[PDB]
């Protein structure tokens, strides 16, 4: 992605844990599974790891989730070989202010 | 892995700092891609700058 709407954007994206090397494969047709997300000041390039986990809502497997600013014009790369749970959906922040 | 092109280089420089506090060897071991430091910064005095 291109920066393109004049200010910084709320990307965020994440990862996949898997509880099973099985239910790896059968998601994603491979290991050593690698989630790259780089930009001009941001580079993060994070391993899934498969591992038995406590049963969690009846899953083992987690998300990592993770959030950076594509601040001005600043391209944003994904590269995956699996894994990756990607952002259909940029956050721009509209204004500036004073919330809580 | 392809990072944006920046000044025409996709890879980077990761920086690292320390300090050999006192008599502490230091090792750097690498099969390659070490930026290695022939100069040392010892600190000369204590003070209050900023
Ligand atoms: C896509 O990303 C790039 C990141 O480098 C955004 O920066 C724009 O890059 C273009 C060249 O790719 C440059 O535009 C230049 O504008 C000057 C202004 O006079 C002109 O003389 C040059 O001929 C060239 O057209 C410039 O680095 C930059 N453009 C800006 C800051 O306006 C680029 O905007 C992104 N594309 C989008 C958002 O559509």
């Known amino acids: 992605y291109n ?3 004049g200010e910084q954007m709320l990307i965020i994206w994440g990862v996949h844990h898997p509880n099973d090397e099985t239910e790896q494969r059968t998601l994603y047709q491979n290991v050593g599974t690698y989630v790259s997300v780089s930009t ?4 993060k390039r994070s391993t899934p790891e498969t591992a038995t986990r406590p049963k969690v809502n009846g899953q083992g497997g987690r998300m990592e989730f993770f959030w950076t600013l594509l601040d001005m014009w600043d391209t944003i790369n994904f590269e995956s070989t699996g894994n990756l749970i990607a952002p259909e959906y940029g956050f721009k922040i509209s204004k500036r202010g004073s919330s809580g």
């Open 3 to 5: 920066n393109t709407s």
């Open 40 to 43: 001009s000041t941001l580079n």
